[PDB]
Design a protein around this ligand. Structure first.
Ligand code: HEM
Ligand code: HEM
Ligand code: HEM
Ligand code: HEM
Lengths: 146, 141, 141, 146
């Protein structure tokens, strides 16, 4: 996590404009659609057979919002991601058995989602800041794997 | 493998790129240089400053090649043979870097085609770039 | 693409493995579990303790499939259709993991087939495991 | 490092038995052969047209010894690889233009060479500690890239 002050202000300024409910649903839905193998964790979510079935699934939307919720909190502790994410890291490992590569796929999808939404506002340099952030979060979420 | 659906998706999204391909190619490069600085090791000879003509020049070349793969979506291995040879034999770019550029290309398109960058299209474009990358790396060893 | 030399190299090397493939399968998994603990996420239902019969059995299964692949080195896609299916639609192991097992397999062969693990043979086996990996993840999406 | 005293001792003790001369030449040569694209940095070495020509090339063998040398000295600063490879990290970036991914290819090759050499001695637990070191080294070397 080598976020220069200016990189941190940039992450923070944009994050101000995000509708986490919405972005959360889009990011998660899109993950399940671009990398269908990730659907392995959600067989109790019902119908994920097509893009519309995934994107509109009330369960995916609610889970996405939860995930992004935890992520937003992460953004207020950019200083201590490991600490912030420790009980979650343990849960994903020990209870959920989620391969951490999943955390990196979601980060990339999220970046595409932010680009989709902010258009020209998501400048090369803003992307570079967010790239560092999703990586830091993925790393924090994997820190307790064993 | 790309399905009929994928093919339609790609031709459609790329269709919209039209005349901006060049500029979107340049932008994907800059995004890549900024987010994954290790990719810069391959362009020691380039002026990577903002608005660099070398980068502009290069973005166009990459875009033309992608445009050519879309035009020959049913015969990419053959349409890209030459480029596959260049990369394997001269440039010798480590394979991991293809995924990085692909990623920056997807970000660029997303940033410019909001109405078209649907989940379905996103998935199609991702499979496409993966296939291009596979072709370009096929003769490495 | 496996060259004829490669196919020869592989068949030779695997030829020497013989009645030990099962043991080598089991050893490669054990090395994978310890070196890349994230791989354990796919085996929550297994006893991953040293010398576990679940691990031994699975080691055999994997070894056997490799054998069958060496045997149909000319027609892998077809020889492993079922397995490609299973992985793409049931197991859904993330593609990054295939590279980890492949590596632990080289390490295991190296440690057991000193004379045979020449530089040229090393290169061939790697390509081979790579091809096997491509086949197993070809129907993912 | 995130090496256990036990992991540290295992690393340390096997290393004591290593001929850097021979392992260095073999590791670099295998690299040039398994991943032919890494030859892009050694055009001046000569004929690397065949395994034989690579493995026999003295320039290769001597560069191999230089690399493992530096690696070997890094094993003495296992608690600050970052600081040990700082200058070498800048060099590699700024002068050599070596993509850090190369550091990872070599690491894996190195592990295959050790297994090759030590057979029985190179146990799963010992490989695990070595995997952590090679990763550690690669990270340290890539640390100053910008
Ligand atoms: C930014 C990364 C992520 C964050 C912050 C995050 C956060 C969360 C939170 C807050 C929960 C609920 C905890 C609880 O039930 O006590 C959860 C559950 C879960 N997460 Fe994650 N998550 C992330 C990534 C992922 C990814 C990428 C996957 C799978 C591809 C995943 C799989 C799951 C599953 C399967 C559950 C349990 C759902 C259920 O209740 O059945 N997570 N996550
Ligand atoms: C799908 C992805 C890619 C496409 C379509 C592509 C296509 C091209 C094309 C059309 C050229 C120009 C060849 C000529 O002179 O006619 C080129 C050159 C080059 N590419 Fe690739 N490439 C791709 C990926 C990469 C990646 C990922 C890298 C490194 C990060 C890379 C590094 C280079 C370099 C260093 C050159 C030479 C540029 C010069 O000296 O002018 N390429 N590529
Ligand atoms: C070198 C490539 C691989 C080959 C040839 C291979 C082969 C096999 C075989 C033969 C089976 C047993 C099918 C049956 O039960 O009838 C299997 C199952 C399985 N494989 Fe793959 N595998 C490979 C890579 C991987 C990797 C890298 C992972 C995960 C890290 C993995 C995860 C699994 C799991 C979880 C099972 C089911 C285990 C059980 O519940 O018994 N495989 N594989
Ligand atoms: C274990 C990781 C590595 C270490 C510790 C290392 C260390 C060294 C050292 C100590 C030098 C001497 C140069 C000087 O002081 O002027 C050197 C040079 C060099 N290294 Fe690295 N290196 C590593 C990996 C690599 C890899 C993987 C490559 C490319 C495949 C590479 C390419 C080079 C080149 C091209 C030179 C310049 C040699 C010359 O001047 O002909 N290095 N390295």
């Amino acid at each position: 996590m080598h976020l220069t002050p200016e990189e941190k202000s940039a992450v923070t300024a944009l994050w101000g404009k995000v509708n986490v409910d919405e972005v959360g649903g889009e990011a998660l839905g899109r993950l399940l659609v671009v990398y269908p193998w990730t659907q392995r964790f959600f067989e109790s979510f019902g119908d994920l057979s097509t893009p519309d079935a995934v994107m509109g699934n009330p369960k995916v939307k609610a889970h996405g919002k939860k995930v992004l919720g935890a992520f937003s909190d992460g953004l207020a502790h950019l200083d201590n991601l490991k600490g912030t994410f420790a009980t979650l890291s343990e849960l994903h490992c020990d209870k959920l058995h989620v391969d951490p590569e999943n955390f990196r796929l979601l980060g990339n999808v999220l970046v595409c989602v932010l680009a989709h939404h902010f258009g020209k506002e998501f400048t090369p340099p803003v992307q570079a800041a967010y790239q560092k952030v999703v990586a830091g979060v993925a790393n924090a979420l994997a820190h307790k794997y064993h | 493998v790309l399905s009929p659906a994928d093919k339609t998706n790609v031709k459609a999204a790329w269709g919209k790129v039209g005349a901006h391909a060049g500029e979107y190619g340049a932008e994907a490069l800059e995004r890549m240089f900024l987010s994954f600085p290790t990719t810069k090791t391959y362009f020691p000879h380039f002026d990577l400053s903002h608005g660099s003509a070398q980068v502009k020049g290069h973005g166009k070349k990459v875009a033309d090649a992608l445009t050519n793969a879309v035009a020959h979506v049913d015969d990419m291995p053959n349409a890209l043979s030459a480029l596959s040879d260049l990369h394997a034999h001269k440039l010798r770019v480590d394979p991991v870097n293809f995924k990085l550029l692909s990623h920056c290309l997807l970000v660029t398109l997303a940033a410019h085609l909001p109405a078209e960058f649907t989940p379905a299209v996103h998935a199609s474009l991702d499979k496409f770039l993966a296939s291009v990358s596979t072709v370009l790396t096929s003769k490495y060893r």
